[PDB]
Design a protein around this motif. Structure first.
Motif, PDB file in Angstrom:
ATOM      1  N   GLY A  60       0.817  -1.197   0.000  1.00 39.35           N
ATOM      2  CA  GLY A  60       0.000   0.000   0.000  1.00 39.35           C
ATOM      3  C   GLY A  60       0.852   1.248   0.000  1.00 39.35           C
ATOM      4  N   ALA A  61       0.245   2.385   0.341  1.00 44.94           N
ATOM      5  CA  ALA A  61       0.960   3.660   0.365  1.00 44.94           C
ATOM      6  C   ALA A  61       1.923   3.780   1.548  1.00 44.94           C
TER       7      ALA A  61
ATOM      8  N   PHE B  26      -1.471   4.231  -8.945  1.00 42.87           N
ATOM      9  CA  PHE B  26      -1.902   2.899  -8.536  1.00 42.87           C
ATOM     10  C   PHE B  26      -0.977   2.351  -7.469  1.00 42.87           C
ATOM     11  N   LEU B  27      -1.573   1.895  -6.374  1.00 39.20           N
ATOM     12  CA  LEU B  27      -0.805   1.350  -5.272  1.00 39.20           C
ATOM     13  C   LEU B  27      -0.671  -0.158  -5.331  1.00 39.20           C
ATOM     14  N   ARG B  28      -1.797  -0.850  -5.178  1.00 38.14           N
ATOM     15  CA  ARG B  28      -1.806  -2.308  -5.162  1.00 38.14           C
ATOM     16  C   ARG B  28      -3.149  -2.872  -5.553  1.00 38.14           C
ATOM     17  N   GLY B  29      -3.174  -4.189  -5.760  1.00 39.32           N
ATOM     18  CA  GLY B  29      -4.398  -4.876  -6.132  1.00 39.32           C
ATOM     19  C   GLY B  29      -4.506  -5.286  -7.594  1.00 39.32           C
ATOM     20  N   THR B  30      -5.743  -5.487  -8.044  1.00 35.06           N
ATOM     21  CA  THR B  30      -5.998  -5.874  -9.425  1.00 35.06           C
ATOM     22  C   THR B  30      -5.828  -4.662 -10.339  1.00 35.06           C
TER      23      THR B  30
ATOM     24  N   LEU C 130      -4.305  14.611  -1.401  1.00 36.62           N
ATOM     25  CA  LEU C 130      -4.428  13.286  -2.081  1.00 36.62           C
ATOM     26  C   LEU C 130      -5.534  12.435  -1.483  1.00 36.62           C
ATOM     27  N   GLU C 131      -5.788  11.290  -2.102  1.00 38.72           N
ATOM     28  CA  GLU C 131      -6.870  10.415  -1.669  1.00 38.72           C
ATOM     29  C   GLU C 131      -6.575   8.926  -1.865  1.00 38.72           C
ATOM     30  N   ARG C 132      -6.417   8.154  -0.786  1.00 41.64           N
ATOM     31  CA  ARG C 132      -6.225   6.712  -0.981  1.00 41.64           C
ATOM     32  C   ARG C 132      -7.611   6.127  -0.972  1.00 41.64           C
ATOM     33  N   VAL C 133      -7.863   5.202  -1.880  1.00 36.87           N
ATOM     34  CA  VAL C 133      -9.161   4.580  -1.935  1.00 36.87           C
ATOM     35  C   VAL C 133      -8.994   3.138  -2.350  1.00 36.87           C
ATOM     36  N   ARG C 134      -9.819   2.284  -1.761  1.00 40.14           N
ATOM     37  CA  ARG C 134      -9.814   0.881  -2.111  1.00 40.14           C
ATOM     38  C   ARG C 134     -11.140   0.774  -2.822  1.00 40.14           C
TER      39      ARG C 134
END
Ligand SMILES: Nc1ncnc2c1ncn2[C@@H]1O[C@H](COP(=O)(O)OP(=O)(O)NP(=O)(O)O)[C@@H](O)[C@H]1O
Ligand SMILES: Nc1ncnc2c1ncn2[C@@H]1O[C@H](COP(=O)(O)OP(=O)(O)NP(=O)(O)O)[C@@H](O)[C@H]1O
Ligand SMILES: Nc1ncnc2c1ncn2[C@@H]1O[C@H](COP(=O)(O)OP(=O)(O)NP(=O)(O)O)[C@@H](O)[C@H]1O
Ligand SMILES: Nc1ncnc2c1ncn2[C@@H]1O[C@H](COP(=O)(O)OP(=O)(O)NP(=O)(O)O)[C@@H](O)[C@H]1O
Ligand SMILES: [Cl-]
Lengths: 417, 417, 414, 413
Positions: free
Chosen positions: A8-9, B13-17, B366-370
């Motif tokens: 993650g971040a 993009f951080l992580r995931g699909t 900024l904005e982290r979002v899942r």
């Protein structure tokens, strides 16, 4: 703060929870004085060994590579082990001359009968459990029990009258007529139990069916005096490979499950030995039956020096086998876990692993606290092969490590005959 | 990052699909060797034996895709088996050296399960294919009695030189209790089915079962064709399991048997790294609870097995294999194709959305979002011939258009007998 | 705004999209002759993907199905109508049209024997006559019932006496022995004899048949064949009617017919120009149909267009079972929501969810929300519904108008 | 204002609440209407049924009482599952009917009195033999119905429609004798031939022996609930009983309730008919076999059902969760009276049923009425949410006084 490690971040400060660290960082941390074994190249904490390891991952992700590596290093250290070895792969690579083979259809197999493990009276029921594993359902188990009654009393007698024959045991328990069997049974504890009402008869019927289902292989098994128990007690005993050919797996399931279970109970009687180190490699826990001793073995074998290594794919597997509640308990008994990455088609298991891996509470810039999964289910589904997360038992961080394919020359034929 | 992701574009993009454009993906996956295609996208060689699951509503293009898949695979010269409804694939791809199994087609082969027995263990092995798994716990219990009856009877008939299906059927569903009982004398089943009311009850169960399954097996044209041998013969050609839809319910047990047969048989094939076999099960949920599919999907890598199955709603397969087993089953397909379904089935849409995955992103307020890469709503609103492709392992997914390539009929789909 | 219930937004990102009635009407309009759902022209391609009309009682389910039917007739499509109290009949009844009602002077003479053409057809319809068991156990008996049925009926047919009275007699009246005797020679010969279990099986079968067969017996005799009817182009239309105070009595019969069509259409010679409608006013009111499923999946080729009505999610669930009901509904690609009662928040949620959410950008902040809230559904006024045709189309809230139709035939006779 | 939560600047979508008076105005119509807690009910909401949920002593009575009164003033007919002849002693007139096996004024009734056609036999065995709580229970129930219908049919045939005889054969006669009696009837074979067959019979016996009792001990007569319905000047029907006998009468009452439910479905179309069914506590009856369709097809008949409920768990346990949901769903109009803080689950259910709204202050989606608001409700205070597109309102129920124009009970002779 949290790169090349956390997915993650990056953040400003770690508050609490699971800590993820780089492969290397971890490999130092875990390195200890004594000779250790390796999991995906990471030195396993000596104290984590008898805490058992659980390796979960999809098909083709590298479970083999891993358990193989794990086995090799443990050998270089001179540890003994039992390996549920499908298609004698482990065998052909590590098999030695003094080692043992269990495979009713392999020229090199040992001669065995569960009789070869009876040493006290309590041992009768004891192994009727290994031979007749636990019923998938309550009802199934009920029959299962009746089966063990019949089995233990019959074999008990055959032994007494000096004819501990599997063929004989089989005949009586699944061939002789009801009455003849009944007669034979006179004198034994079962004499009355299986007679007197329709219920009683019904119960006998069930017992017959079960035994006819399990025993088959046990009978057609080459005869000998080999004792898994004795073997365990002999230092220079060597190693044990329980092998079989894949197209017969379903047929041997019950036999192998017996052997594996045998061991699980046997180790519990072993003489106090602080220097003993035994490994139980059950490649796929879910493919065996609902073992009767495994549980306690994963809980009381630290003293004997038992180290279990099992693998799984979907959580639904073991569940269906052991039952939901019982499955939970069982998994929970493995203190150390390895996550190999699965398929996207199974989001539920990816969630289970993501959560097993844990969350962490972090303080990040814009200050803000955030509680989040160290590894997202997504990350697990998207893992490339030969890559896994390793979270050793206890208070240790986890890390994503690459699995390397070391090559091993074949020092023996996988199968003979 | 727009033009590929449906939600709001983001800064990082951080992580995931990860989702990417059709083309983009098409380039990524493109390999050196000859590959096959899934909706135009070149399938990575390594993902082939990891199986493909195509999920989608009716009329979305499941056909068009499987058709494409098959075509391309033939151009490369791979062999395959096709659960082919109404002989569609046949009329388009069938060649003269190819095989057909359809009891009501002039061109079918003559077959009986007897034709696949090569060793003693093969009896139970195939009784499993003949008598699929029961839908309920109770059901399966009956099914087991059926297999016992089946295998012991068939074994004897074989022994006495009369491997007749008509004979077997007679005995197992026509012969009087006593006569049958008599016939079984000498076989393992001799005693097991007699002695108490339970014993009788058990037999009755088996009769019913066999009477349900066998029917079609009997009325089946006689020949000596062996799916096993076929698999072993390189120049063997391809196999089409066809049937006319109005008779689907009637053949379900026979077809399921064949499919299963394949699933178990490929496990005995001699080591051939050069082998490439496809199994097309147009709609997995329409077959019976297959007894070997599981292991097939897990141990057919070195036999070269590549399975392609289709599904619509998750509740379908659940109902057939049971929730836990279905999970395991679906989880065994590493690669997935989402074709888009009905708004009347939010549950399934959710499952697919979830299987596609979430991602963690950084966006400008900024904005982290899942968030879900693909919304459930997005799948329900998909227009036809449009689907998300998420190949096994670590790769981005992509929304690709499926195109209708035309195929000339190079053979009649059905030839009344 | 005027289209979306919530706060107007700056930019649509992804998800379901709602539009104005008229706007939608424009969009769905095609060249060829089309039918209408609440005034909106249905995409020709959406037709064999079926339509599920969900709504509370009195919301106008009738008005809609009535309109749909009419427009389809204007186009000359054929149809079967699970028509209660012969309402549909009295309005659209034609002289050349068929009627199935054992208590109506104009009904046709029918026996299930009338649909047997090949051997596999015996079990095929035993399925229609003896629907699926609500429970696992229930179904087990049901299987026995169908065994008894098919073997008995088959023989009767053989000895040239395809009598429903005889059949009923044999399967629920004759003594165990006599029946057992009669069964000698048939596959069922041994299966129902040999142990207590075997006799239990028989007993179970008897009870079943004694529950289903009744109406089949007392049904006027004739040679009419739903199959044959389906194949005949000039055939006309089929109305399955009955008087409400007898619905329970006829449930198994009607369920049989409905199903028969469901399997039947699967054997029709392929004809790209065929257009058939199946109106099952209230899907949940029938039995657990044995063919409906495949009908809603493989009838595109035959040109089958099913239209069903539903009220509460719990209904269908209770009849087909949760898993099966999911699958079943999922098979209707097009949906209409008529708005229900406050007393049923669960179904309201289901509808809300089925309608979908959308992701939008507004004054920037972006949000994910349900296009229609359950509450919105619950407070819907009558003759008002949401139309969300299958595929990639926006949904719209449209008013249903009460068009008037003159009675060109008596609803019930004699 | 009347909204419990924080005042807002603009309503977007969802349930809208308003003041008692405001609603009272909106709902008011031309014609004569009835009143729910003072609010005149939209005539079109009448055949949509009314569900009144509330804890014990919250005013359920006062409401149904009021509702009933205004209905009579309009000259509507009705049936009232009236515990302890309460409603009777207040509104009972000379021309009205009474069904109570232990009341001097009761009528003489047998289910036979309702059989008019052949399908009518099973039709009513359903009323007499309610649905079984469990699947297995219902299995027995069906055997019972078979026995019941086949037997009664014959007794009727041979001219002896006796409930005493019927009871005899079905629970007293020996197996064989019964067996004998059944020869000639469809049930002849069905109940013989295997142990399973005998087991089925044994079960049917027991069921009947559980339901029939009261039906026997019931004063004989010629009264027919069906005929009553058809007769305009028929008056009103009061099903009354003494509270300490409620469990014993449960089956018979349910029977009646049910009878009505099926029967109205046969009434000749009369656009002018207006009938009310007052089931004080729906959950108190058995698993009625016709209630369902009645609440769905009785519009043409002019049926208007009003049932009361306490905990959603009650109804659930009786009808099963799935079935219970469906049933509840069938009443379009609802009244929430406020319940115990010891039952948050139902409170939630009610809160949820009342609904949420989307408002502008920021946008917020919130429950118009909190579960807590419902638990903290004072007595004689309720929320009214009529069927359809209407706002709801918190209104006070006032205790109007009614003079006793007849004795509630009369155990006689
Ligand atoms: N001799 C080898 N050469 C190259 N790659 C290999 C070799 N052995 C294993 N691999 C790689 O590792 C993967 C398989 O790992 P492994 O641990 O054997 O998987 P598994 O699921 O336990 N069994 P399998 O599906 O038979 O491979 C293969 O897909 C290869 O990518
Ligand atoms: N030769 C063709 N011409 C035109 N459109 C075609 C053609 N083949 C397929 N299609 C389109 O693709 C759809 C069917 O795709 P397909 O994969 O066959 O669906 P399915 O659900 O597997 N079976 P079906 O319902 O029978 O169409 C049709 O509805 C058409 O829109
Ligand atoms: N001939 C008609 N004249 C006027 N309004 C009508 C007419 N038919 C239906 N309506 C209106 O539409 C409503 C009922 O719609 P409808 O589609 O019949 O409901 P339903 O649930 O299918 N059956 P029902 O409750 O019997 O009306 C009525 O409440 C009327 O307001
Ligand atoms: N004559 C009266 N004078 C004053 N208060 C009354 C009177 N009748 C009823 N009440 C009030 O209203 C309550 C009962 O309302 P009611 O609607 O009868 O409740 P219920 O739950 O339907 N039945 P119950 O528990 O018997 O009271 C009482 O607890 C009183 O507070
Ligand atoms: Cl009399």
């Amino acid at each position: 703060v949290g790169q090349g490690e956390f997915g993650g971040a990056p953040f400003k400060r770690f508050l609490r929870g699971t800590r993820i660290v780089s492969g290397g960082k971890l490999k130092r941390m875990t390195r200890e004085k004594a000779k250790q074994v390796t999991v995906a190249g990471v030195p396993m904490p000596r104290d984590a060994e008898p805490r058992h390891l659980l390796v979960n991952g999809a098909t083709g992700t590298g479970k083999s590579v891993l358990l193989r590596e794990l086995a090799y290093t443990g050998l270089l250290r001179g540890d003994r082990m039992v390996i549920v070895d499908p298609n004698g792969d482990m065998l052909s690579k590590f098999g030695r001359d003094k080692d043992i083979i269990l495979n009713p259809y392999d020229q090199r197999t040992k001669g065995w009968s569960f009789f070869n493990e009876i040493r006290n009276d309590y041992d009768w029921q004891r192994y009727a459990l290994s031979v007749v594993p636990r019923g998938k359902t309550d009802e199934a188990e009920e029959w299962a029990s009746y089966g063990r009654l019949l089995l233990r009393e019959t074999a008990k007698k055959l032994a007494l009258i000096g004819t501990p024959s599997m063929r004989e045991l089989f005949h009586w328990t699944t061939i002789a007529t009801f009455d003849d069997l009944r007669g034979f049974l006179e004198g034994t504890l079962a004499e009355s139990l299986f007679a007197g009402s329709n219920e009683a008869s019904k119960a006998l019927t069930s017992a017959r069916f079960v035994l006819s289902d399990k025993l088959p292989e046990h009978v057609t098994m080459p005869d000998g005096d080999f004792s898994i128990r004795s073997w365990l007690e002999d230092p220079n005993g060597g190693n044990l490979f329980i092998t079989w050919r894949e197209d017969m797996g379903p047929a041997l399931r019950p036999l192998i499950s017996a052997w594996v279970d045998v061991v699980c109970t046997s180790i519990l009687s072993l003489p106090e030995e602080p220097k003993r180190r035994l490994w139980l490699f059950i490649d796929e826990l879910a493919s065996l039956e609902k073992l009767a001793s495994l549980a306690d073995a994963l809980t009381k074998g630290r003293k004997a020096g038992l180290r279990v290594v099992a693998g799984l794919q979907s959580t639904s597997q073991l569940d269906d086998v052991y039952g939901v509640k019982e499955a939970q308990t069982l998994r929970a008994s493995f203190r150390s876990l390895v996550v190999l990455g699965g398929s996207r088609t199974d989001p539920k298991t990816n969630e289970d692993m993501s959560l097993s891996l844990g969350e962490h509470e972090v303080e990040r810039d814009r200050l803000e606290r955030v509680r989040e999964r160290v590894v997202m289910p997504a990350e697990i589904a998207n893992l490339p092969d030969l890559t896994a997360y390793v979270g050793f038992a206890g208070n240790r961080p986890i890390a994503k490590v690459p699995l390397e394919i070391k090559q091993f020359a074949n020092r023996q034929p996988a199968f003979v005959e």
